[PDB]
Design a protein around this ligand. Structure first.
Ligand SMILES: O=P(O)(O)O[C@H]1O[C@H](CO)[C@@H](O)[C@H]1O
Ligand SMILES: O=P(O)(O)O[C@H]1O[C@H](CO)[C@@H](O)[C@H]1O
Ligand SMILES: O=c1cc[nH]c(=O)[nH]1
Ligand SMILES: O=c1cc[nH]c(=O)[nH]1
Ligand SMILES: [Ca+2]
Lengths: 327, 327
């Protein structure tokens, strides 16, 4: 059920309990781990290991412990890494038992108790945007999420009650897009994470009088896919006539969600966020996501890679580290 | 929709058309690429590049061109790599168009025509088995496939007609397991691939009298998951109470499919094979899978990693190379 090495490491993420911080940045690309850890406090990296697509490094930022982990691509990879983080934080290997939480029936009244709210997890990724308004290389910050994948369906996502706002998102997506064919699920980033990210963006821009060092951002719904091409409505060769949702981008882009705190739109599409939000919330860990827009699927109809991306990612790394330690 | 750089490479797989063989081995673990390429003919490796979890090397095996590609984990990763292989093989950059196939309405009478059956793609992976009879470190060779993931739902898998045998598998899975809650799909490895793999196993075993060097194998149905833990029925900490299919292993292990070529059982569980089979068949490419059983989920209830795995994987690499060039 949960393979643990003789060295106390989990199976994919080769990290031991005492090497993992409560505050974690997820990146998809293993290459981004070294870029991020370079921003950690000088000589603070105390643990690091690489295996498959899964790399980590743990240091400090402004004195607060932080771990950066590459997950590789997809919600399936997320499911792996979050299960292993769960075991590293809450399975006491020394005693061979799961840690108590407040409210456990047969726990001693003294505990000790593990507080899941101490876990803060933020994805810093890349993404596409179906929104005409959203600029190239903007930071798209997740509030709600649409799971077009099915990973969380194995964790009762199809039956567990959701908020009124999430019910409205699901209704609109099911009625007004080709996802009518899919048992989609929803989730939401923890409000504390979304707020922290936005505040960090604001602080960044306020701290520079150079227009070139500004970072644009947007907040909205992130749609997460179980692939990159047809799974995101890309039309490729001999596959295109077989697509279930060939007009995914335009369909998602047309949506407006009339939600409790105002109107929300689908700001971005990527491959991890839905499961990060859902599985983290299920565990009581605070999670969210922010992704640099590298593909404009409308308007510009371009990709934005290379130097421009590198510069945007440098700004966003600092913003996310700031948000993470202030959460 | 299909980004191809000026260097002629696709976005994730960093291979040029002229560097990719018609015969391909897929591995999940990027580490396995170097292990496999070491079995290529001496001084034959002519192209290689790494990016994210996606590594390749192209050489020859007994004179036939072969490429090994790591996909990383999951059907989402497969969707990426197969789309990119499709473009590299069938998008003609010099013509600015997709290659003609026989049957195309407005193709020139003489073509030329790309023959998709020239593509031979075999996954060599690791897996779990829910089958009591399947020995540890056996090679589980895919005939039929169950997609417990949803990647191929984006390619009409939920509505496209399937064979009588696949209809029966779906019926039995829905009848007798908690997967009735999921719009599961099915596929099948190409018969030529299944047969070639089995023949290579038989040839390996006939060539040695050393019992310690025999490779046991089974042929059957591979169930593919959108994760590793709850998505494969593993029970982990605070997730366990929220599983949709907590008895997945016992339920899958109990199934018998009374199919046209005889009785078939679920031999193995892993993360890539359903989409490999489904998407390749959709393209007309010949594909299949063979995975070393590293997790016995019933009976033994153990993992089989380390030197024992290394020895089995060495045998199986040679077997799959033999199968691949004979296909
Ligand atoms: O750049 P990363 O963080 O991987 O994120 C995005 O890029 C990958 C696909 O190219 C997917 O992982 C997607 O979510
Ligand atoms: O060993 P590889 O080829 O990655 O295959 C298996 O191992 C991974 C999970 O550990 C998944 O990719 C699964 O399909
Ligand atoms: O369109 C995009 C761009 C980056 N990552 C994605 O998953 N999709
Ligand atoms: O049980 C297992 C073992 C390896 N790979 C899997 O996907 N599952
Ligand atoms: Ca994946």
């Amino acid at each position: 059920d949960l393979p643990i090495g003789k060295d106390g490491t989990t199976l994919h993420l080769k990290c031991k309990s005492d090497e993992l911080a409560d505050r974690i940045i997820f990146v998809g690309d293993p290459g981004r781990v070294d870029v991020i850890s370079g921003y950690f406090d000088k000589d603070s990296i105390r643990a690091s290991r690489d295996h498959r697509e899964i790399r980590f490094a743990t240091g400090t930022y402004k004195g607060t412990p932080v771990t950066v982990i590459s997950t590789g691509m997809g919600v399936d990879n997320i499911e792996i890494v979050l299960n292993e983080i769960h075991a590293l934080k809450e399975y006491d290997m020394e005693r061979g038992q799961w840690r108590h939480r407040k409210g456990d029936a047969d726990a001693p009244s003294a505990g000790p108790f593990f507080d899941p709210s101490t876990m803060k997890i933020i994805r810093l990724g890349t993404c596409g945007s179906p929104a005409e308004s959203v600029p190239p290389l903007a930071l798209a910050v997740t509030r709600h999420a649409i799971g077009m994948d099915n990973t969380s369906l194995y964790y009762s996502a199809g039956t567990r009650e959701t908020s009124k706002d999430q019910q409205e998102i699901r209704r609109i997506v099911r009625e007004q897009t080709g996802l009518r064919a899919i048992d989609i699920y929803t989730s939401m980033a923890h409000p504390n994470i979304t707020k922290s990210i936005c505040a960090a963006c604001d602080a960044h821009n306020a701290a520079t009088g150079s227009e070139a060092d500004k970072q644009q951002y947007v907040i909205g719904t992130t749609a997460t896919a179980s692939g990159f091409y047809g799974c995101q409505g890309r039309r490729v060769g001999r596959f295109m006539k077989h697509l279930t949702v060939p007009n995914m981008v335009e369909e998602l882009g047309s949506l407006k969600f009339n939600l409790s705190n105002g109107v929300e739109v689908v700001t971005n599409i990527e491959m991890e966020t839905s499961a990060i939000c859902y599985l983290s919330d299920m565990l009581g860990y605070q999670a969210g996501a922010a992704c640099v827009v590298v593909s404009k699927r409308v308007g510009e109809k371009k990709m934005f890679l290379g130097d421009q991306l590198d510069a945007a990612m440098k700004r966003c790394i600092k913003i996310i580290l700031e948000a993470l330690v202030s959460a």
